[PDB]
Amino acid sequence: RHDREFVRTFFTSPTAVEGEDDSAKMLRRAAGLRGMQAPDVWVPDNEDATAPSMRDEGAENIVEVISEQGAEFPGEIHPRMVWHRDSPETRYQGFQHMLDITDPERGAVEHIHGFVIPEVGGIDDWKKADEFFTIVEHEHGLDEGSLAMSVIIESGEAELAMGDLRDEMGKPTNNLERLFLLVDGEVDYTKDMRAMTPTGELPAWPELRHNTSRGASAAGCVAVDGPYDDIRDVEGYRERMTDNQAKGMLGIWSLTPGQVVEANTSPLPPKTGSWLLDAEELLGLTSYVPSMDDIVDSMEEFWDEATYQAAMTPISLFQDVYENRPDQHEELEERYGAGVVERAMEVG
Amino acid sequence: RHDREFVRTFFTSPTAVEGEDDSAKMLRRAAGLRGMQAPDVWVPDNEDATAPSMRDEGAENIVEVISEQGAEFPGEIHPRMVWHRDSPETRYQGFQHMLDITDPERGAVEHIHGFVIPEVGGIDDWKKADEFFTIVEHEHGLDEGSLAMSVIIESGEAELAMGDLRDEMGKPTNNLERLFLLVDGEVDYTKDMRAMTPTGELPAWPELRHNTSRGASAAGCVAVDGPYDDIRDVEGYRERMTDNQAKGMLGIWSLTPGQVVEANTSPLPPKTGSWLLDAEELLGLTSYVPSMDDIVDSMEEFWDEATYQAAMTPISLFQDVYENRPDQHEELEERYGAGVVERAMEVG
Amino acid sequence: RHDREFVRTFFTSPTAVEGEDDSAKMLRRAAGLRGMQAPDVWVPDNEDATAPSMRDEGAENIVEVISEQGAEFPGEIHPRMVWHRDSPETRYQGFQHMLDITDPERGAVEHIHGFVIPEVGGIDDWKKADEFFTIVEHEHGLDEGSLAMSVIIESGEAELAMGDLRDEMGKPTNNLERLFLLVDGEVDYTKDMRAMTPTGELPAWPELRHNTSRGASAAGCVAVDGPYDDIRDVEGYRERMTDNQAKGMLGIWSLTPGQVVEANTSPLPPKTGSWLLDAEELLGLTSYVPSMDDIVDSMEEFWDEATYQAAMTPISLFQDVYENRPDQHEELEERYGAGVVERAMEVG
Ligand SMILES: [Cl-]
Ligand SMILES: [Cl-]
Ligand SMILES: [Cl-]
Ligand SMILES: [Cl-]
Ligand SMILES: [Cl-]
Ligand SMILES: [Cl-]
Ligand SMILES: [Cl-]
Ligand SMILES: [Cl-]
Ligand SMILES: [Cl-]
Ligand SMILES: [Cl-]
Ligand SMILES: [Cl-]
Ligand SMILES: [Cl-]
Ligand SMILES: [Cl-]
Ligand SMILES: [K+]
Ligand SMILES: [K+]
Ligand SMILES: [K+]
Ligand SMILES: [K+]
Ligand SMILES: [K+]
Ligand SMILES: [K+]
Ligand SMILES: [K+]
Ligand SMILES: [K+]
Ligand SMILES: [K+]
Ligand SMILES: [Mg+2]
Ligand SMILES: [Mg+2]
Ligand SMILES: [Mg+2]
């Protein structure tokens, strides 16, 4: 239902960076990318890529930068707004930023293809977002359905919501036809699922990626994988894409122009080859399993709000266990030290 | 709800082969198989195993061969008809061939156990097929529900449709009790999911096989895996079955009498052994990752319509990218050569 | 919705053991556990851990032992009752034992946190169990919703039922808010899915564990993995938990105090370490793939009813094949011996 049949690169940029300067710096550069360095989809990101006290400013910079520079940008532009299935405030915030940004007088709207909506819940949460797109279009004389909606799949409820999308989208009481991308968000998803790994590196969640690909094919949307944080790990990123491509998930998130170029290239067939036959640089060979002490520190002396929350599970578990198991209060001191116990018990 | 509690082998044969001769040759031989060489289920295949201009002839040969030879055939016989969730013509075609084939005057119907229906969509597409079985039974005085229906699961929508089968089958407005097999079709499925792999060998789709096994156990049907093309790769076929058997998927597709014998044997417990302890023939050791040039050729100078379509994705992707990214038009020539670019741009 | 935000250990004990003695021996000891040796959740198990002719006695011992010793027990107590989606008798049995056990005069109810219900089917089966909790609470003046309900997910239908739990629980016609744990039961599940493996060791069912974790996060329950039988295999148990923890499944079944301690410890962050870098005791290194002869014997000369049933598949398959394929009757004798064929044909 959309111009892009396939999207390989989904690239995010903070919208207002705090360090003095031009807070719209990241956006102006990124709006300058061309060729293999430019994403098929570009996401001025007013959500997690951007500190909350910066978000009203980020919304302004989005209009300023796309006003000034959007006509030229060779891919499609879809800013991520804030949203949360569990928070009416965040939802209203996301909507008011969508309404400013699309004010036709400001010159941004005509280079904007749609918005990306994070944290959606079950299908009745998607209908709330859909309802805000509809109202925004009507307030500004945009054609109905002209703003594409894309969602980040980053909770269990959203993963389930993809299963009856075909028949929900057909109901005449929503304009859910506007759906474009179903984008995995492995970071917040790890958190919502309360998963933990010893390195604190993300699980691979193959089933989420299968489900997101399936949902996309049944519903006529386009499936895209989420952020791959270890940016230096070029070969890892390529393994993950090759892996995603085997599931029919052909696009991935990109965090840097390097990742844009790798991701833009990977699903394209090779130049030449190839025959296969059966039988300081140390950092990409090491990993570190933190102790409780270290995990405490990596928030206590204190990576966005997704990386933060998503690392708090072994500690919320420890907390739960200590609150409810007085009989284990001794062995837990025996094991961490009276110091650390009483210390980990404050983080929540 | 069916005579076969378990089906190990699901074996297909073209119904009308073009090379002069007796076009029903493949069927007559296959109807001759006995013992470990005979499938539990045999599928005269009027769909993808058979060129479209041969299909009306294939339908006749089905009646001629099962008329002449069906009484003897020691397994169950279930011809695959044509069908497609997105094509009313194909659906009507499949139904008219079902109506001819089952004409009681022709002597085939009484050795026919049911039909296999490819390309089904969501549950309301299965109800269309179910409705055609019902009408065919009534037109020919067959008992209601006597023709078993089996579906190939080879789209995302069909994979989802298995989830509420129990309650849809109970509705008195369909005869969906007739469902017998839920058969994965990894070939067309790879396509519908737009998956690609570097060798162009099929992904393994473990989750589809899990879902198909689950759907079968919740709904009282029998789960069967799809075609395993690399026929010479005897050990691969056995690994895949052992793998399927761990998911509760106990039957697989068979493409040859060799595969029928391997598949007939594999789920049976071994003769003897065994103790396991912890720590030109080159073709089954090589594979070839084609270049864009080669992929172009393998359709441009030009494996059924499933293998064709299912290999067109890296090219439809390339096409999409070239149509929509003029800024990359240079680097794509830099990379494939002006020759190949302009050449790949015609295939659709 | 429950006091325990996280449950690491789900430990079962037979309720009435046949060997002369005090039939409540296992319960009295287990009610004595403290510290790292005590499970977060303890399951006096009146279902498969206990022979059927012992179950009315087991129900009495539950009241006797929790009466006498429950006040002290430092975790939560949730006895498993009998139940089966396909058996009205078993369901009524489970309910009558729940009604005795919770009689306020007997002194057990006030140390009981809820019950665990095995073998549930689709959501309308969960509503039957939910209805029995409601009636039991009313018969004994317990607050509504005070008995937590937990289900063992050990059929395909139950795995599917988790998908619309959020909206079913909200219906005012059930008290399904009481749901607490969604606990995989890989044993009976292997059976219901008709899976088989060469060693007869359980498949890993990663997708079930993904689905159960997802269902739990969408519905506000707590996901727990099922029994890990090879008790001596300490390192295996730790691999499985580390694996489960990557899916957000943070609790597992425990069969022994050893497993309680390993499981209680594993999700807690380590004491120290650790840096990782890229590149008679023979029993935990061997496994045995039984022949048909051996499989026949391991029921014919004859591990609970779950392990029994769950091992009967290669034989029910053999039986089906022999009943329906007379043309293979020779080759099956050629292969097993006339002796074994005619022998395996009696087990059902
Ligand atoms: Cl809310
Ligand atoms: Cl939903
Ligand atoms: Cl992982
Ligand atoms: Cl699913
Ligand atoms: Cl897609
Ligand atoms: Cl249609
Ligand atoms: Cl459907
Ligand atoms: Cl694969
Ligand atoms: Cl099955
Ligand atoms: Cl029943
Ligand atoms: Cl259900
Ligand atoms: Cl396995
Ligand atoms: Cl959980
Ligand atoms: K609509
Ligand atoms: K509408
Ligand atoms: K897809
Ligand atoms: K029906
Ligand atoms: K009917
Ligand atoms: K099954
Ligand atoms: K309720
Ligand atoms: K209620
Ligand atoms: K979870
Ligand atoms: Mg996120
Ligand atoms: Mg097919
Ligand atoms: Mg069980």
Numbering used by the authors:
A (entry chain A), B (entry chain A), C (entry chain A): 5 to 283, 331 to 353, 387 to 432
Quote the study that presented this structure, word for word.
Malate synthase, one of the two enzymes unique to the glyoxylate cycle, is found in all three domains of life, and is crucial to the utilization of two-carbon compounds for net biosynthetic pathways such as gluconeogenesis. The structures reported here for the glyoxylate and the pyruvate/acetyl-CoA complexes of Haloferax volcanii malate synthase represent the first examples of an H isoform member. The overall structure of hvMSH reveals that, like MSA and MSG, this halophilic isoform is based on a TIM barrel and indicates that deletion in hvMSH of an N-terminal domain distinguishes this isoform from those of MSA and MSG; and that the surface of the barrel normally buried by this domain and connecting loops is instead involved in trimeric and hexameric interfaces, suggesting a potential evolutionary coupling of the N-terminal deletion and oligomerization. Despite the sequence divergence and overall smaller size of hvMSH compared to MSA and MSG, the active site and catalytic mechanism are conserved in all three isoforms.
An atomic model was built manually into the experimental map, and was used for molecular replacement to solve the high-occupancy glyoxylate complex at 2.51 Å, and the pyruvate/acetyl-CoA complex. The high-occupancy glyoxylate complex was prepared by increasing the concentrations of MgCl2 from 13 mM to ~0.1 M and glyoxylate from 3 mM to ~0.1 M in mother liquor after crystal growth was complete and one week prior to data collection. The final model has a crystallographic Rfactor of 0.195 and an Rfree of 0.248, and is comprised of residues 5-283, 331-353, and 387-432, two glyoxylate molecules, one magnesium ion, three potassium ions, five chloride ions and 134 water molecules. One glyoxylate molecule is bound to the Mg2+ at the active site and the other is bound weakly in the position at which the acetyl-CoA thioester resides in the ternary complex (below). The structure is in good agreement with expected stereochemistry, with only one residue in the generously allowed region (Thr 276) and one residue in the disallowed region (Glu 24) of the Ramachandran plot. The enzyme also coordinates the magnesium ion with identical residues to those found in MSG and MSA: the side chains of Asp 192 and Glu 158 in hvMSH (Asp 455 and Glu 427 in ecMSG). Two water molecules complete the fifth and sixth positions in the magnesium coordination sphere with nearly perfect octahedral geometry as is seen in ecMSG. One notable difference in the active site between hvMSH and ecMSG is the conformation of the tryptophan residue adjacent to the aldehyde carbon of glyoxylate (Trp 257, and Trp 534 in hvMSH and ecMSG respectively). However, in the hvMSH complex the different rotomer positions the indole ring to interact more with its face than edge, with distances to the two closest carbons in the ring of 3.7 and 3.8 Å. The rotomer in the hvMSH structure is held in position by the side chain of Phe 14 which is packed against the opposite side of the indole ring.
